[PDB]
Amino acid sequence: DPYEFYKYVHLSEVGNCIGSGVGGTSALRGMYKDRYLDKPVQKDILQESFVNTMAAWVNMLLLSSTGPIKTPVGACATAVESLDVGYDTIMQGKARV
Amino acid sequence: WRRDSRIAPLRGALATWGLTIDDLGVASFHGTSTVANDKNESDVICQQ
């Protein structure tokens, strides 16, 4: 239970820094093409084209937290930049997990 | 004030320059002209 974190730590220390290069590439299409084509697309596919909507969903289903979130776009090398971002954020008292 | 349970970060950075919350004069609001955001924005900054 990710809530187990809220034994040892306050709601505001579980941070979330998951990023991507473009991410949401599928909704991104439904917006710029599937809709101009008049195919049946959701009304909110805009929601799901943002890099940080993934991140958000993680927080809305698992770890309900008032933690920092900084989602990066470092193209091919995103995943590492994310480690950096998360690293630094943790080394500034912003969060522990 | 890093991780100080007895010092809110707002206090912290303000106190480091010799100020309390009373010196926070202007609050710049997101305030998007939408229904919920403005009732909420005010709220958060208020409670704080």
Partner: peptide, 29 residues
Amino acid sequence: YEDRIQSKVFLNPQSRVTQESNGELKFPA
């Protein structure tokens, strides 16, 4: 946290979840 507590939990930098009477994790009233 139950909704009524939210503001308090958010502001008490030591408020932490306790084990509960089903096994669920909950901030106490």
